[PDB]
Amino acid sequence: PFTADKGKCGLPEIFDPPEELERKVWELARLVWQSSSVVFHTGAGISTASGIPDFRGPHGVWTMEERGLAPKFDTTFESARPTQTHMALVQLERVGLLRFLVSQNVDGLHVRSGFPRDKLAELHGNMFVEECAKCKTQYVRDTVVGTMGLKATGRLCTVACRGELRDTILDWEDSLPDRDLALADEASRNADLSITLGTSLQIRPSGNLPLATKRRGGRLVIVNLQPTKHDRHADLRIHGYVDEVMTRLMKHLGLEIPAWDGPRVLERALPPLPRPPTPKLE
Ligand SMILES: Nc1ncnc2c1ncn2[C@@H]1O[C@H](COP(=O)(O)OP(=O)(O)OC[C@H]2O[C@H](O)[C@H](O)[C@@H]2O)[C@@H](O)[C@H]1O
Ligand SMILES: O=[N+]([O-])c1ccc(O)c(O)c1
Ligand SMILES: [Zn+2]
Prior knowledge:
The chain has 282 residues and is an alpha/beta fold. It has two domains: 17-124 and 174-269, no CATH class; 125-173, no CATH class. 24% of the residues lie in helices and 15% in strands. The chain has helices at residues 18-34, 61-66, 84-94, 109-112, 178-190, 209-214, 242-253; strands at 38-42, 100-103, 120-122, 129-132, 138-140, 152-156, 164-167, 193-197, 219-223, 236-238. Strand 8, helix 6 and strand 9 (219-223) form a beta-alpha-beta unit. Helix 1 (18-34) packs across helix 7 (242-253) and helix 3 runs parallel beside helix 7. The longest helix has 17 residues, at 18-34. Bound molecules: the ligand Nc1ncnc2c1ncn2[C@@H]1O[C@H](COP(=O)(O)OP(=O)(O)OC[C@H]2O[C@H](O)[C@H](O)[C@@H]2O)[C@@H](O)[C@H]1O, 4-nitrocatechol (4NC) and zinc ion. The site of zinc ion (ZN) has 8 residues, from loops. It comes from Homo sapiens (Human). Its EC number is 2.3.1.-, 2.3.1.286, 2.4.2.-.
């Protein structure tokens, strides 16, 4: 806990200049069109524009802690709106340009975004989701589950059970949930395109999954303001705000970023919605 390694925190940000940024997103555009199976890996950087601080960035939880300062939240978890990036990932799934989404975030926004849970691994859990110890039934709640570290919440299961309900937030010692990690690994290995959004890729095995894609000739794209463990293995690193990259990307793809109607829960994914026809690439 106190001892736990929080890896490299407070590294400098890189800012690709507009010309290099605009061009790198057109190449990302091309790789989404080329790819049969596109998987997105997300981390706390896709939630920073909502007012949720990240961990290892300039004003990250771990970064401000090293310098004896406090992270600053500009919102509560309950009153946080999903980002343009969160809503872009929703459209990309709906139009069939996103096979699987893998997140290290516990902020709960993916789910609150309306994103299909059966196409999502929440690898470090969800602040809003408690799980029945007895029958493994999950409850997506409307306020944050008040505990952390797979502890009893105080509520009991309501299946036609009275099983102990506990949080889904992994403690430093706790192993990842096998179902989520297994689907996340299959998705990552099977993928021909893995795009990482606002993660430093410093945690095992979360951070290593985008590298499973690169095996069998898959392409790896890293969108992050800072360096990242596996920058060396990327075919494309984009250094900029992900909201900018994903707003420009969606515009190249001919896609609108949909409205957020407030917190909604989508258990299962629907058949793909119509999407624009693919440009001639080669
Ligand atoms: N607007 C932005 N656009 C793009 N990148 C951004 C933005 N804001 C921040 N970033 C980048 O976003 C990156 C986020 O890196 P880290 O803070 O390590 O997030 P993680 O999701 O990998 O944390 C992993 C786990 O570790 C914890 O213990 C928990 O268990 C976490 O689940 C940085 O490089 C920022 O520069
Ligand atoms: O307080 N928390 O639990 C936090 C702190 C920072 C985060 O980026 C986060 O997703 C949750
Ligand atoms: Zn139960």
